[PDB]
Design an enzyme around this catalytic site. Sequence first.
Site, PDB file in Angstrom:
ATOM      1  N   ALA A 269      56.791  80.071 -24.716  1.00  0.00           N
ATOM      2  CA  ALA A 269      57.503  80.041 -23.428  1.00  0.00           C
ATOM      3  C   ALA A 269      57.614  81.388 -22.714  1.00  0.00           C
ATOM      4  CB  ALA A 269      58.906  79.480 -23.625  1.00  0.00           C
TER       5      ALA A 269
ATOM      6  N   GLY B 281      55.246  83.980 -23.247  1.00  0.00           N
ATOM      7  CA  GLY B 281      54.043  84.702 -23.558  1.00  0.00           C
ATOM      8  C   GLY B 281      53.829  84.697 -25.055  1.00  0.00           C
TER       9      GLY B 281
ATOM     10  N   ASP C 184      60.642  88.622 -15.057  1.00  0.00           N
ATOM     11  CA  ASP C 184      59.718  87.525 -14.693  1.00  0.00           C
ATOM     12  C   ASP C 184      58.787  87.231 -15.854  1.00  0.00           C
ATOM     13  OD1 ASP C 184      58.018  85.623 -13.509  1.00  0.00           O
ATOM     14  OD2 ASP C 184      58.049  86.621 -11.554  1.00  0.00           O
TER      15      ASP C 184
END
Length: 341
Positions: free
Chosen positions: A30, A32, A164
Amino acid sequence: RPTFYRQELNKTIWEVPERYQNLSPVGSGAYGSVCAAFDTKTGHRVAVKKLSRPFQSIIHAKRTYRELRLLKHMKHENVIGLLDVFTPARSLEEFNDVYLVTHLMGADLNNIVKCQKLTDDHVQFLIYQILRGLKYIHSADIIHRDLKPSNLAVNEDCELKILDFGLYVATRWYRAPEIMLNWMHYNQTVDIWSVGCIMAELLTGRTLFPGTDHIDQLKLILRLVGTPGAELLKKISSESARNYIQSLAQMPKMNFANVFIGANPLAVDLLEKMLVLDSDKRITAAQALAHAYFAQYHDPDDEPVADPYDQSFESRDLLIDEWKSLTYDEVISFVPPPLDQ
Ligand SMILES: CC[C@H](C)NC(=O)[C@H](CCC1CCCCC1)NC(=O)c1ccc(CNC(=O)c2cnn(-c3ccccc3)c2N)cc1
């Protein structure tokens, strides 16, 4: 150059400095390809992200550069920052992997509204910190664009950081109407729309605008904020947009006190100032920090702006190896942050 060591994790190769110990995958993809680890230099837990195929194409190569540039820039308490960046390569020729080290954060806000029924005081503090970090990003002419509860991370002490994680909870549900439809006439206040959606959800426990697609999304929005008046129609250059909007049966702006019933009226008022359709009239981050809703936390001497950020690279069209070399440069020139804490 330090001494690296190598292991295999969940179908991936990880070569990292001895400094980092006890790698353990987190978030099942979720986030990376990211490991929690123990930093022996500080005795702190950290997160280590190994970029996936960073220089596979021109576009990956440029994204990689962009992420690194942005991360090296961010020095603010409510924005993710870079503790370390490393590659095991000894030379540009060998350069193929990029690892990024950041603080390990406690949980996201999706997993906190999804759990708790948040108190007004907690909402004040969380939204205050978002806005404080946004004042900083915005001051460097950086726009987040993807603000949503899973891109906000908080610790047990409720200290929040903006991040992000990239590509349950849809971006469109938090996205400003102007960058939903057309994409010409927008500013930094697309992020403020998103903060309004987030704050509403923290207050009520419900996604404010849970649309199924861009058309449905817009319809949910217009039901709350009303259809555009002639003053806002004047500023729509997209003919198709303007035709669409004016085709709809006209809807009144709702009184937000009748929607957010029982909420702190200072919360309601701030939401009226965030969730306005015309982006030229939406409150900025800087203005919102001075709103009476944040009286307990606002300190105009401790809401810093950023150094300027050289974004000129964004308009360049370069080859993979050129983006690669630029990223190599940024790895080499990295000065780690002061440790004292
Ligand atoms: C979408 C594009 C790419 C992918 N984005 C970026 O460019 C930005 C940097 C840019 C910056 C970010 C904030 C302001 C706007 C721009 N990039 C990151 O933000 C960015 C970069 C690296 C990381 C590495 N850290 C983690 O993975 C991490 C940290 N806490 N936990 C954790 C664990 C459990 C529970 C909760 C949290 C994680 N899993 C984390 C974020």
